[PDB]
Amino acid sequence: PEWYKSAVFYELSVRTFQDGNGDGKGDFPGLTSRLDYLKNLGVDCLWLLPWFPSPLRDDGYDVADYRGIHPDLGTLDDFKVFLREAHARGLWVIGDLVTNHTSSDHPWFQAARRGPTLPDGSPNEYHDYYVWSDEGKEYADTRIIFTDTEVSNWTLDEQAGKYYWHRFFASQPDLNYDNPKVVEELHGAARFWLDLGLDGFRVDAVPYLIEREGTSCENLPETHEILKGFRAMVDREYPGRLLLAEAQQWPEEVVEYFGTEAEPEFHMCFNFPVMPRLYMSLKREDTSSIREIMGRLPKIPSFGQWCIFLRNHDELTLEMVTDDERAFMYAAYAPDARMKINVGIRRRLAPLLDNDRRRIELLNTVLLALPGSPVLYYGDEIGMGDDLGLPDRNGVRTPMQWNAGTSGGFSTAQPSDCFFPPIQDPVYGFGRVNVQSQLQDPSSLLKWTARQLELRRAHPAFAHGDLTFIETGNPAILAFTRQYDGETLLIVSNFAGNAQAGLLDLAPFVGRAPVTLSGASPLPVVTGNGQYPVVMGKYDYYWLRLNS
């Protein structure tokens, strides 16, 4: 198989990971020094958050140059060395490619806002790089995404004298993909980094490329035709490189972003459908939404692979769930009204789960045993907290916590001078929650995560096998099998806070013994009708093999 199907991904922001020089900002020398850490964790692929020049109004998804490195993070020489050094360790790196839009500080938009013709009468070729309107009445009734901050997707530019389209902040004017010059600019921006050795891109906000009257302005066929073109460009010029899509859509529209065997689009897509249902199931002590949504996902192409995750740099999004499912989630997980943003929740993993390590391990085992390639968010592997006193999703992006020294060892600069202030509270602070502490602890969450990744690495059915849910007779107990190359795994997970009793339909496996993956302990052989009774403690996870 291709590499990305077997890979464990780790998402980090280069600005908040390791400061190498005391300026209070993470940089690429700093990241390079921590590469043995990520390797020893069992990570196979970094995914770097946007590293480009930018005024950082959206923390860098507002690109003011696609072919350079933000000064904060170092130089392009530093980047190249980091890339050389990760490859020397068998690490893959994928960047973030921001296609839909650019910063209003981009030179293109600085040109385009001057009018259709320049002060010397010649046409201004940059003007059609963006999406203009005389009055701003086109594409009405389409969703606003930053519902908390923006009142419209049209904002008047007082210089150019007319409106311009943006799905995100006013400072992020959308690019005009009906202009063929724009498509080739992003082909070329992609080409620039793939030539440098980068192994692929997470492409960002793909559903919103093209805008058409009379539609939702999402998942448009024309948009998919642009992405089919990216994949052709990459597959032709850079074999082996990965294209990963962020598609916050319902399952039927999400599988579209894989394309098909004839016309491929993305290699990999983020399984947003399942993610919120893992948290609803934990509070509802009931797993049936997981199976429901999981069966609403069609078979994807051979080249395709789901990308499972629990949290990320963003809010826990609640926009692709029902009105009932959403109200429940808010009540379960957003007691303070401040914890809500943009139809979602802005909390780190550990606070969501009340810091309960039994619950943290449960979800992460379901993360690693579900079909796809997992992606860890930076610092979740040690149980970091959030800082809601930071605006707009920034409270989950606080600096990594390496040790209990100055600023958590993220930087020699005092925490007040760190780009984001490292957390120092009594529950989640760096004096209590840090990597050094947990490397010396025999039983730390860090070492648990590494032990668990190693256990999954040993059983290729986790990455490549099929998935079949099993009847348990109890909505709190989720059970399924993964089948691959004549290994059958049995994953039985309790989602309740107390002991639960199941009855598993192991009819097809009569005369087989389930044995533990850990420690090889025999459980009774499946007999008779195949109905197999189990008791499970609170939040237990049984990782089992069915011998032949």
User: Where along the sequence are the contacts to its own copies (CB under 8 A)?
Assistant: 354-357, 403-404, 425-427, 431-432, 434, 436-437, 440-444, 496-501, 516, 518-519, 521-524, 533-538, 540-542, 544
Nearer to Mg ion, 21 or 548 (CB): 21
Cβ atoms of 130 and 173 closer than 8 Å: yes
Residue with tokens 């009340």: 354
Q: How far is the CB of 536 from its own copies (least distance, A)?
A: 7
Region label for 251, one of left (φ > 0), alpha (ψ between -120 and 50) or beta (otherwise) = alpha
Query: At closest approach, how far in Å is the CB of 278 from its own copies?
Result: 18
* Binding residue for Ca ion, selected from 41, 209, 360, 517, defined by CB under 5 A: 209
Could you give the CA distance from residue 166 to residue 155 in angstroms, rounded to a whole number? 8
CB 453 within 8 A of CB 447: no
Question: What is the smallest separation between the CB atom of 98 and its own copies, expressed in angstroms?
Answer: 37
**Alpha carbon of 163 to those of 100, 113, 174: distances in Å?**
17, 10, 12
Q: Is 19 annotated as a binding residue?
A: yes
Q: Note whether 160 and 124 are within 8 A (CB).
A: no
Has 310 been labeled as part of a binding site? Answer: no
Q: Is 417 annotated as a binding residue?
A: no
**Phi then psi for 302, rounded to 5 degrees?**
-60, -45
Which among 21-29, 40-48, 96-104, 331-339 is the span making contact with Ca ion, rule CB under 5 A? 96-104
Q: How far apart are CA 206 and CA 181, in angstroms?
A: 18
Residues touching Ca ion, count (CB under 5 A): 4
Dihedral of alpha carbons 233, 203, 294, 251, sign: negative
542 touches, from its own copies, Ca ion, Mg ion, none (C-beta below 5 to 8 Å by class)? its own copies
* 100 annotated binding-site participant: yes
Between 230 and 539, CB nearer to Ca ion: 230
Cα gap 548→513, rounded to integer Å: 8
Q: Name the residue nearer to its own copies (CB basis): 362 or 463.
A: 362
Where are the extended beta strands (E) located within 115-241? 132-133, 154-157, 162-165, 200-204
Using CB under 5 A as the binding rule, whether residue 218 contacts Ca ion is answered as: no
Q: How far apart are CA 202 and CA 98, in angstroms?
A: 9
- 21 labeled binding residue: yes
Residue with smaller CB distance to Mg ion, 169 or 410: 410
| Closest separation in Å from C-beta 27 to Mg ion | 4
Query: Is 37 annotated to bind ligand?
Result: no
- x/- map, 14-33, Mg ion, by CB under 5 A: -----x-x-x-x-x------
Distances (CA, A) of 287 to 89, 203, 479, 483: 39, 31, 9, 21
Q: Does 78 bind Mg ion (CB under 5 A)?
A: no
Please report how close the Cβ of residue 333 comes to its own copies at its closest, in angstroms.
13
- Our CB check for its own copies shows the closer of 187 and 538 to be 538
- Residue 436 C-beta: closest distance to Ca ion, Å: 45
Side-chain-facing half-sphere of 208: CA atoms under 13 Å: 25
Q: Does the annotation count 204 as an active-site position?
A: yes
Minimal CB distance residue for Mg ion: 27
Report the run of H or E that residue 491 belongs to, with start and end: strand 487-494
Q: Does 99 bind Ca ion (CB under 5 A)?
A: no
Residue whose pair of structure tokens reads 């072919």 in the numeric block: 67
10, 376 contact by CB (below 8 A)? yes
**Binding partner of 209, given Ca ion, its own copies, Mg ion, none, CB within 5-8 angstroms per partner class:** Ca ion
User: According to the annotation, is 529 in a ligand binding site?
Assistant: no
Residues 6+ apart with CB under 8 A from 62: 54, 55, 56, 98, 101, 102, 103, 104, 105, 169, 171, 172
Which of 257, 428 has the CB closer to its own copies?
A: 428
Taking the least distance from each CB to Ca ion, the nearer of 223 and 438 is: 223
> Shortest distance, CB of residue 167 to Ca ion, whole angstroms?
6
436 binds, among Mg ion, its own copies, Ca ion, none (CB under 5 to 8 A by kind): its own copies
Residue nearest to Ca ion (CB): 174
| Alpha-carbon gap, residue 258 to 227, rounded angstroms | 10
Contacted by 519, from Mg ion, Ca ion, its own copies, none: CB < 5 to 8 Å by type: its own copies
Work out what residue 403 binds among its own copies, Ca ion, Mg ion, none; the CB cut-off runs from 5 to 8 Å by kind: its own copies
157 is catalytic: no
Known binder of ligand: residue 141?
no
Q: Determine, following the binding rule CB under 5 A, whether residue 174 of this chain makes contact with Ca ion.
A: yes
Tokens 């602890």 belong to: 441
The DSSP string of 13-51 is -GGGS--SSSSSS--HHHHHHTHHHHHHHT--EEEE---
- Neighbouring residues of 439: CB distance < 8 A, sequence distance ≥ 6: 446, 447
When the beta carbons of 221 and 533 are compared against its own copies, the nearer one is 533
Q: Which residue has the tokens 């009708």?
A: 529
Provide the 10 A C-beta neighbour count for residue 388. Answer: 16
What is the smallest separation between the CB atom of 422 and Mg ion, expressed in angstroms?
14
Is 174 annotated to bind a ligand? Reply is: yes
Place of tokens 């990241």: 31
Residue tagged active-site, from 199, 246, 265, 315? 246
Which of Mg ion, Ca ion, its own copies, none lies near 100, with the C-beta cut-off 5 to 8 A by kind?
Answer: Ca ion
Catalytic member of 11, 59, 204, 386: 204
User: Residue 209 annotated as binding?
Assistant: yes
368 and 456 Cβ atoms separated by less than 8 Å: yes
- Answer for which of 13, 32, 100, 155 binds Ca ion (CB under 5 A) is 100
**How far is Cα 515 from Cα 378, in angstroms, rounded to an integer?**
33
Give the residue with the Cβ less far from its own copies, 181 or 338: 338
- No. of helices (H) and no. of strands (E), the chain: 15, 20
Q: Which residues bind Ca ion (CB under 5 A)?
A: 100, 174, 208-209
Annotated binding-site ranges for Ca(2+): 100, 174, 208-209, 211
Which residues are catalytic, by number?
A: 204, 246
Q: Which residues bind Mg ion (CB under 5 A)?
A: 19, 21, 23, 25, 27
Annotated binding-site ranges for Mg(2+): 19, 21, 23, 25, 27
